[model samples]
Target: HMETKFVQALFDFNPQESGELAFKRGDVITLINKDDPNWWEGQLNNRRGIFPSNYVAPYNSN
Candidate 1:
């Protein structure tokens, strides 16, 4: 549920902006994986990370 929630949140965060952000030190971005619900990803300063669904917001289920 969290991956689903996070992906939905990321989508909502920028309805018009798509694709990965410019990787930079200390910069943070969120990524989504449709194949796995537990693999919601994030990146910061060129470092990639994976997080549980609880790490993001809950919205835009429509």
Candidate 2:
């Protein structure tokens, strides 16, 4: 089974595309992909897009 993972933003992210997901510090996002080391895909506010991996950290649901 695929376990769902989450991430919490450590800094704000503003993407050029309005359709991309944007988040600020303390925001929680659901991780969708981490295939690349530098960039990762996540879903926030019902929108999904790639974001900088350095801006977020793994979030424990417990």
Candidate 3:
């Protein structure tokens, strides 16, 4: 998970396919990969899948 970004979901996202990840607003995820600009790979609840890049933003502890 080194160099990976942890992001926060800004809105709920229901997967369109099994390969996509389902998450609710305010959910947290480790953004594992970003092979594409529009879609990125993330992990949450031991689940990994593709999610819309615009759905999340880099998280900070503040």
Q: Highest lDDT among the candidates is held by which one? A: 3
> Candidate 1 residues 10-50, lDDT tens each?
22122134443333322244454434575455543344445
Position 57, candidate 2: lDDT: 90
Among all windows of ten consecutive residues in candidate 3, which has the lowest summed lDDT? 53-62
* Order of quality (TM-score): 3, 2, 1
TM-score of 2: 0.79
Which regions of candidate 2 deviate over 4 angstroms?
18-20
Which lDDT values do the candidates have, in the order given?
A: 0.39, 0.81, 0.83
Q: Is candidate 1 or candidate 2 better by lDDT?
A: 2
lDDT of 2 by residue, 1-62 (tens): 66667889899888888645788897888888777898878888578888787898988644
